[PDB]
UniProtKB/Swiss-Prot annotation, chain A:
Highest rank taxon of the organism: Eukaryota
Function: Molecular chaperone; assists the folding of proteins upon ATP hydrolysis. Known to play a role, in vitro, in the folding of actin and tubulin. In yeast may play a role in mitotic spindle formation.
Subunit structure: Heterooligomeric complex of about 850 to 900 kDa that forms two stacked rings, 12 to 16 nm in diameter.
Protein name: T-complex protein 1 subunit epsilon
Full-length numbering of the shown residues: 126 to 188 of 562
Naturally occurring in which organism (per UniProt): Saccharomyces cerevisiae (strain ATCC 204508 / S288c)
Swiss-Prot record, chain B:
Effect of residue 46 to E: Temperature-sensitive
Subunit structure: Heterooligomeric complex of about 850 to 900 kDa that forms two stacked rings, 12 to 16 nm in diameter.
Disulfides per UniProt: none
Shown chain mapped onto the complete sequence: 3 to 80 of 559
Name this polypeptide is given: T-complex protein 1 subunit alpha
Protein family membership: Belongs to the TCP-1 chaperonin family.
Naturally occurring in which organism (per UniProt): Saccharomyces cerevisiae (strain ATCC 204508 / S288c) (Baker's yeast)
Signal peptide positions (record): none
Subcellular location: Cytoplasm
Functional description taken from the UniProt entry: Molecular chaperone; assists the folding of proteins upon ATP hydrolysis. Known to play a role, in vitro, in the folding of actin and tubulin. In yeast may play a role in mitotic spindle formation.
UniProtKB/Swiss-Prot annotation, chain C:
Residues of the full protein shown: 145 to 192 of 528
Subcellular location: Cytoplasm
Domain of life of the source: Eukaryota
Annotated family: Belongs to the TCP-1 chaperonin family.
Note: Present with 5530 molecules/cell in log phase SD medium.
Source organism: Saccharomyces cerevisiae (strain ATCC 204508 / S288c)
Protein name, entry field: T-complex protein 1 subunit delta
Gene name of the record: CCT4
Swiss-Prot record, chain D:
Keywords: Acetylation, ATP-binding, Chaperone, Cytoplasm, Nucleotide-binding
Cellular component GO terms, alphabetical: chaperonin-containing T-complex; cytoplasm
Physiological role: Molecular chaperone; assists the folding of proteins upon ATP hydrolysis. Known to play a role, in vitro, in the folding of actin and tubulin. In yeast may play a role in mitotic spindle formation.
Matching CDD domains: TCP1_beta
The protein's name in its UniProt record: T-complex protein 1 subunit beta
Species this chain originates from: Saccharomyces cerevisiae (strain ATCC 204508 / S288c)
């Protein structure tokens, strides 16, 4: 969030209206989510034996 | 007017610095405060005004030359 | 000494100064002041 | 029972000590970031007048910062003494004296050594360190070519830590030629430094002849060819009559009109004796009245007034003449000659420039900068560089710098530490590790790992190669002879001697009695 | 091809504040002008600049607008020497 | 790759340099409105 | 711009790392002389009722003596 505000401060000094800055971030937010959604794959095809492995993978990251 | 602005945020000044339209708004009020005197004294139908020094003496002056000279105005644009 | 280059550069250098509207007769004023002192050694042209 | 009184702070035993050690750490950490060519400058803001100063000198930083710690003033005074005798390395003295206490702090703690026993360890360690540093020195001045090249390498090392480090390549010739023109006499009164706003730092040029800011008389022309320069100690002013202590007794005003005219003829006859020399230029120490000034116009004599006390000797040596007082005998006080007296202008203030004089015994340095904060440092940067180069004339012994000198001295310490029996041997080895703290900080301020550079430098010297050193540009070990880093022996000797004695004083303090401030 | 080159990219963009300020003080859009500035200054070698009277981009030589070289040269030199002095301050200590 | 080489200490100068730039740019913002023929005078 | 309120003490720099380590030194040095059979007992001066307590155990000494340093509370 602060990174968006740091790049917005440079655009305000250039004379850009703040609403035009907010309108650009909303359109760019959906383009990033739709791009990452196509890259990921579905792991639900695996059985319960492999499904436990994916739970151990994301656990060690948050720990 | 309205609420006073913040005092020297990241600006690091010892005095008071106001920016934006508040300066031009106070500059008009400075000239409008001194005008309302000279206004009523214009024309043959104008009326004299009496200035007092608080020492017991009064000064009757119609024109704004001596009036503005006697009245102390500390506003820079005034 | 060129009246075209010196006068146009003096009025442009004023820019936002209050004398920009008065720059008509003031632009030849600053030019003719320096032209009285001329040298080929490019001295600093003391303003005293 | 409180004998001392009210509001008397006193610390004893473990309370007294560790107040000097932490006091030295707080002082040592301030100048720790200013050590080395990659060091960072420190800004000092005064509590009054709102005056700021940017300085890299460890001595000037400690003088401005108020310190109420009695032990902190110990490191402040040694920074002034190092600045008075030499003028360079005041930062290294404060750091080295602080590292001696940091190592001695763990000696009394971990190894349980009496403080006086540690003092005996530094006495045997400093004796072997000065012997190894003296044998590593190289003789100089035997050849005029090698003597001049060594002065260039010294100026590049001192200015490396200064803000001049970018332009110091061109400034090595600026500070070198000023010392050679002194003709063996060591003084900084003969070197003038003028601050000028505008331009860039590298625009500073060497002054041929002597340049001093003055003004010509009203009717006197600016340019005179082959003018004779004279300096007069006496001032042209109302003298009363002779002995002062008198006042005129006038019975009738008929003699009073001719009385004032007689005073006008006395100064006129004094200029007549000056005109017998045939000089085209005259210089006075103090303000000249308008009456004697008019006599110089008809005689074609330039006039210079309000000369500073230092400007009298600076101008007299460049021209070759001497200051004239009585003017009676023309044969005495032979005067020199100046080729070009024409005045130039640098910035908005015109500066009087001379060229083609007989002697260069006095010098002048022109400096240009963007702000006064740079000009204030530009004067003190050359003041520290010219001080070492001036001491190099009388002291020809020089050693290799760049962290190499501290490592060579530490080699002889560990050699004699093995033959010293008792608990005082641990204090001897602590002095060797304290000398390794100076090259360690050099790597920390440059952004390079200190453990890798010091380990490669320490093991390379024990192999018999004493020419190895630290290279902060490539971040590796390089030869000091190829890089051209040379420092005077008087510089390194004053750092080891002052730091070893300063740490000895604070280790002798078991109690601190602070009287009530006034 | 170095970290010094990445700094020079910000040095060129830092000089764009002068033409940007001219548009903001005149009420015109800065990006709309700079978009025309980049296209015209590619083919034109010089004299292409912002004119406050016509409110747009035109030839400054035909408009007689001119400035000495010492004004712009010293402005770049004194600015680079001041930034070097500011970035070397690692702390501010109170003194007497 | 990490845990080696050196680690940055005494990061206050990193904040001091930021405090000096922010304070300097704040002064440059008031004078910025006076640039160009469209600039305005500053009464002090 | 100060986001924190008035009378808020914070150290974002070397002063924090120095105060955290030195804060544990005074705690370690207090119970240092109490380790071993040759150690000496410590005296506790109560702020109320003037009740003196002498104990060699470091648990009572650290809990009785007020410590505002978070490095000491650990």
């Amino acid at each position: 969030a602060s990174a968006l505000l740091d790049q917005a401060l440079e655009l305000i000094q250039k004379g850009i209206h703040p609403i035009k800055i907010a309108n650009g971030f909303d359109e760019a937010a959906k383009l990033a989510i739709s791009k990452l959604e196509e890259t990921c794959d579905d792991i639900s095809a695996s059985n319960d034996e492999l499904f436990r492995d994916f739970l151990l993978r994301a656990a060690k990251t948050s720990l | 007017q309205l609420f006073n602005n913040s005092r020297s945020d990241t600006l690091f000044l010892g005095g008071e610095k106001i920016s934006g339209d508040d300066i031009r708004n106070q500059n008009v009020l400075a000239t409008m405060a001194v005008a309302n005197v000279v206004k009523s004294s214009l024309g043959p139908v104008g009326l004299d005004k009496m200035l007092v020094d608080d020492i017991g003496d009064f000064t009757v002056t119609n024109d704004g030359a001596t009036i503005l000279s006697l009245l102390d105005v500390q506003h820079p644009a005034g | 000494s060129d009246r075209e280059q010196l006068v146009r550069a003096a009025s442009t250098s004023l820019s936002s100064k209050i004398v920009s509207q008065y720059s008509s007769f003031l632009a030849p004023l600053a030019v003719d002041s320096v032209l009285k002192i001329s040298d080929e050694n490019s001295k600093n042209v003391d303003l005293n | 029972v409180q004998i001392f009184g009210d509001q008397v702070t006193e610390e004893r035993a473990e309370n007294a000590r560790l107040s000097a050690f932490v006091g030295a750490i707080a002082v040592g950490d301030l100048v720790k970031s200013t050590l080395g060519p990659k060091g960072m400058d420190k800004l000092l803001q005064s509590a009054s007048s709102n005056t700021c100063m940017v300085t890299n000198d460890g001595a000037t930083i400690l003088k401005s910062i108020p310190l109420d710690n009695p032990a902190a003033k110990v490191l402040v005074n040694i920074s002034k003494v190092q600045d008075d005798e030499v003028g360079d390395g005041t930062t290294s003295v404060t750091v080295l004296s602080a590292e001696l206490l940091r190592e001695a702090e763990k000696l009394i703690d971990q190894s349980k050594i009496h403080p006086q026993t540690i003092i005996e360890g530094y006495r045997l360690a400093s004796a072997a360190a000065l012997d190894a540093l003296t044998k590593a020195a190289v003789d100089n001045s035997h050849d005029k070519t090698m003597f001049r090249e060594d002065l260039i390498h010294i100026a590049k090392t001192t200015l490396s830590s200064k803000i001049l480090s970018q332009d110091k390549d061109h400034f090595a010739e600026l500070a070198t030629n000023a010392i050679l023109r002194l003709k063996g006499s060591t003084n900084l009164e003969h070197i003038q430094i003028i601050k000028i706003l505008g331009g860039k730092l590298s625009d500073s040029f060497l002054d041929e002849g002597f340049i001093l800011a003055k003004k010509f008389g009203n009717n006197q022309p600016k340019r005179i060819e082959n003018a004779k320069i004279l300096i007069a100690n006496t001032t042209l002013d109302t003298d009363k009559v002779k002995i002062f202590g008198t006042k005129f007794k006038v019975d009738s005003t008929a003699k009073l009109a001719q009385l004032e005219k007689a005073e006008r003829e006395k100064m006129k006859n004094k200029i007549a004796k000056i005109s017998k020399f045939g000089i085209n230029t005259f210089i006075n120490r103090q303000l000249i009245y308008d009456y004697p000034e008019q006599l110089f116009t008809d005689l074609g004599i330039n006039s210079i007034e309000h000369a500073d006390f230092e400007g009298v000797e600076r101008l007299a040596l460049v021209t070759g003449g001497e200051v004239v007082s009585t003017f009676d005998e023309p044969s005495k006080c032979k005067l020199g000659e100046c080729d070009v007296i024409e005045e130039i202008m640098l910035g908005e203030q015109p500066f009087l420039k001379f060229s083609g004089c007989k002697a260069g015994e006095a010098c002048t340095i022109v400096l240009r900068g963007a702000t006064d904060q740079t000009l204030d440092e530009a004067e003190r940067s050359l003041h520290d560089a010219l001080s070492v180069l001036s001491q190099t004339t009388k002291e020809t012994r020089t050693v290799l710098g760049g962290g190499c000198a501290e490592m060579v001295m530490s080699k002889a310490v560990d050699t004699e530490a093995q033959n010293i029996d008792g608990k005082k041997s641990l204090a001897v080895e602590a002095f060797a590790r304290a000398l390794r703290q100076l090259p360690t900080i050099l790597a920390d301020n440059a952004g390079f790992d200190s453990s890798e550079l010091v380990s490669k430098l320490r093991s390379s010297i024990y192999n018999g190669i004493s020419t190895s050193g630290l290279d902060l540009n490539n971040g590796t070990i390089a030869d000091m002879r190829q890089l051209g880093i040379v420092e005077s022996y008087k510089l390194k000797r004053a750092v080891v001697s002052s730091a070893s004695e300063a740490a000895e004083v604070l280790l002798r303090v078991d109690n601190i009695i602070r009287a009530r401030p006034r | 091809e170095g970290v010094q080159a990445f700094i020079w990219q910000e040095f060129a963009s830092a000089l764009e504040v002068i033409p940007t300020t001219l548009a903001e003080n005149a009420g015109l859009n800065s990006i709309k002008v700079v978009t025309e500035l980049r296209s015209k200054h590619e083919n034109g070698e010089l004299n292409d600049g912002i004119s406050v009277r016509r409110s747009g981009t035109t030839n400054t030589y035909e408009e007689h607008i001119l400035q000495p070289v010492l004004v712009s040269t010293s402005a770049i030199t004194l600015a680079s020497e001041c930034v070097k002095s500011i970035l070397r301050i690692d702390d501010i200590a109170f003194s007497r | 790759v990490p845990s080696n080489a050196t680690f940055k200490n005494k990061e206050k100068p990193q904040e001091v340099r930021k405090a000096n730039i922010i304070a300097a740019r704040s002064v440059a913002d008031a004078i910025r409105t006076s640039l160009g023929p469209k600039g305005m005078d500053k009464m002090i």
